[PDB]
Scaffold this active site. Structure first.
Site, PDB file in Angstrom:
ATOM      1  CD  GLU A  43      -3.053  -0.547  -0.094  1.00 28.93           C
ATOM      2  OE1 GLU A  43      -3.771  -1.412  -0.633  1.00 28.93           O
ATOM      3  OE2 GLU A  43      -3.106   0.662  -0.404  1.00 28.93           O
ATOM      4  CD1 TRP A  44      -1.885   4.575  -0.860  1.00 27.35           C
ATOM      5  CD2 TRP A  44      -0.652   6.298  -0.140  1.00 27.35           C
ATOM      6  NE1 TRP A  44      -2.691   5.363  -0.064  1.00 27.35           N
ATOM      7  CE2 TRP A  44      -1.954   6.427   0.389  1.00 27.35           C
ATOM      8  CE3 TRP A  44       0.311   7.270   0.179  1.00 27.35           C
ATOM      9  CZ2 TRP A  44      -2.322   7.493   1.220  1.00 27.35           C
ATOM     10  CZ3 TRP A  44      -0.051   8.325   1.003  1.00 27.35           C
ATOM     11  CH2 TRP A  44      -1.359   8.427   1.515  1.00 27.35           C
TER      12      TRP A  44
ATOM     13  CG  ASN B  43      -7.007 -10.505  -2.729  1.00 26.32           C
ATOM     14  OD1 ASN B  43      -7.533  -9.649  -2.017  1.00 26.32           O
ATOM     15  ND2 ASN B  43      -7.714 -11.434  -3.379  1.00 26.32           N
TER      16      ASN B  43
ATOM     17  CD  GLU C 219      -3.889 -17.494   2.342  1.00 30.20           C
ATOM     18  OE1 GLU C 219      -4.997 -17.441   1.774  1.00 30.20           O
ATOM     19  OE2 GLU C 219      -3.701 -17.038   3.493  1.00 30.20           O
TER      20      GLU C 219
ATOM     21  CE1 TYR D 231      -8.578 -17.860   8.625  1.00 32.30           C
ATOM     22  CE2 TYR D 231      -8.377 -17.782  11.035  1.00 32.30           C
ATOM     23  CZ  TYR D 231      -7.873 -17.494   9.767  1.00 32.30           C
ATOM     24  OH  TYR D 231      -6.668 -16.846   9.642  1.00 32.30           O
ATOM     25  CG  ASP D 232     -11.858 -18.812   5.459  1.00 27.80           C
ATOM     26  OD1 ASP D 232     -12.833 -18.082   5.761  1.00 27.80           O
ATOM     27  OD2 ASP D 232     -10.701 -18.345   5.250  1.00 27.80           O
TER      28      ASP D 232
ATOM     29  CD1 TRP E  31      -9.357 -12.610   8.750  1.00 33.18           C
ATOM     30  CD2 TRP E  31      -7.130 -12.436   8.543  1.00 33.18           C
ATOM     31  NE1 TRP E  31      -9.096 -11.836   7.633  1.00 33.18           N
ATOM     32  CE2 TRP E  31      -7.734 -11.720   7.486  1.00 33.18           C
ATOM     33  CE3 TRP E  31      -5.734 -12.475   8.624  1.00 33.18           C
ATOM     34  CZ2 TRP E  31      -6.982 -11.040   6.505  1.00 33.18           C
ATOM     35  CZ3 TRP E  31      -4.983 -11.800   7.646  1.00 33.18           C
ATOM     36  CH2 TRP E  31      -5.610 -11.095   6.608  1.00 33.18           C
TER      37      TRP E  31
END
Lengths: 364, 5
Positions: free
Chosen positions: A49-50, A79, A119, A191-192, A337
């Site tokens: 991130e900037w 991502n 991931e 989780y998930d 998380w």
């Protein structure tokens, strides 16, 4: 016990009360704070991130308020994908470039360690050979961190990894017994386990299986995931049990059928602040008016439904149950998380600031 | 996860 908490660098972009900035960080809430996420450029650790460098200073600056606090920088995340990791671990030269860059970067910004969050090796685009190449990467980093501590006299940089609960992903990319000896701790993503990608409702993070589940389905719960990582060679003291401060939502085929396992047609409505169909922050489900909350008796976790919306999430009670569980299993602590998904500002749940994570701190 | 995350 450790209480490992993830900070995410995109939470600063949410609107209103949902906006999360390092100013919302409590220096004494967790024992380890992990910054998600760093990426890579030319096989070297880099920001994503900037304004990360500014946030790093504020983040690691918390250690002036709590000297015992340790921080780590996580590289990767969902991502980020797998290609950059695959390309970096492909050769000894690229692994060397990355390892040397990591030590320099971590020391430059005053981080106490690195959290690997690929991931995942061996799946999602990463070939089978990446399972063993990930083992080599972990050995390379461990070797390097130990050497830097010996030559510099500084406290050794920590190395952890965030790992999957799903047997398929675990089998495809992790030589558990090998990497566990080199990692300082293992952040189990417990989780998930279920989500809108399935055709029926199911809980994001159930502690145990439902009576009706057998076979592969019987492994979709926290207990099964913990038993798997311990059985495959992870010392209990190194296994950190991940806890979600968010839930997974579904749109029901029929508002008349709301049980766990009821037909679903897709993701639930995006939350007002998180704007991501299929998930909701704890602060987005804890105050639903006109909703019906129930507890899945054998799984020890709650869900709530209203009309055709159904969401499995974690509350103070399930977090207490899970801490009792991890203690009985002799695990190293809890991981969360994420900081920004709990009601960090205490604006929605009527339980004060950080109701879920404060519960972990008190119970641990 | 598992594309949204």
């Amino acid at each position: 016990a450790k209480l490992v908490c993830y900070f995410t660098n995109w939470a600063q972009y949410r609107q209103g009360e949902a906006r999360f900035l390092p100013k919302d960080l409590d220096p004494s809430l967790c024992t380890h704070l992990i910054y998600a996420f760093a990426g890579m450029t030319n096989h070297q650790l880099s920001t994503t991130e900037w304004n990360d460098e500014t946030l790093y200073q504020e983040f690691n600056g918390l250690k002036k308020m709590n000297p015992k606090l340790k921080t780590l920088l996580a590289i990767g995340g969902w991502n980020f994908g797998t290609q950059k990791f695959t390309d970096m671990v492909a050769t000894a030269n690229n692994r060397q470039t990355f390892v040397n860059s990591a030590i320099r970067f971590l020391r430059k910004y005053s981080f106490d360690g690195l959290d690997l969050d690929w991931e995942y090796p061996g799946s999602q685009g990463s070939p089978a050979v990446d399972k063993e190449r990930f083992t080599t990467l972990v050995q390379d980093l461990a070797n390097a961190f130990q050497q830097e501590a010996q030559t510099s006299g500084k406290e050794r940089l920590l190395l952890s990894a965030a790992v999957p609960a799903g047997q398929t992903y675990v089998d495809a990319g992790y030589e558990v017994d090998k990497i566990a000896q080199n990692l300082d701790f293992v952040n189990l993503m417990a989780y998930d386990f279920h989500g809108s990608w399935e055709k029926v409702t199911g809980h994001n993070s159930p502690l145990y299986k439902r009576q009706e589940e057998s076979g592969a389905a019987a492994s979709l719960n926290v207990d099964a995931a913990v038993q798997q990582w311990l059985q495959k060679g992870t010392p209990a003291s190194k296994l950190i049990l991940g806890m979600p401060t968010y839930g997974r939502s579904f749109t029901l085929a029929s508002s008349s059928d709301t049980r766990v396992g009821a037909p679903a047609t897709g993701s639930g409505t995006p939350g007002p602040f998180t704007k991501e169909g299929g998930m909701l922050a704890y602060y987005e489900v804890c105050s639903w008016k006109g909703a019906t909350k129930q507890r899945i008796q054998d799984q020890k976790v709650p869900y709530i439904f209203r009309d055709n919306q159904w969401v499995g999430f974690d509350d103070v009670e399930s977090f207490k149950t899970k801490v009792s569980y991890l203690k009985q299993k002799g695990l190293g602590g809890a991981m969360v998380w994420a900081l920004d998904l709990d009601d960090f500002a205490g604006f929605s749940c009527n339980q004060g600031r950080y109701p879920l994570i404060q519960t972990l701190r008190q119970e641990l | 996860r598992f594309x949204x995350x």
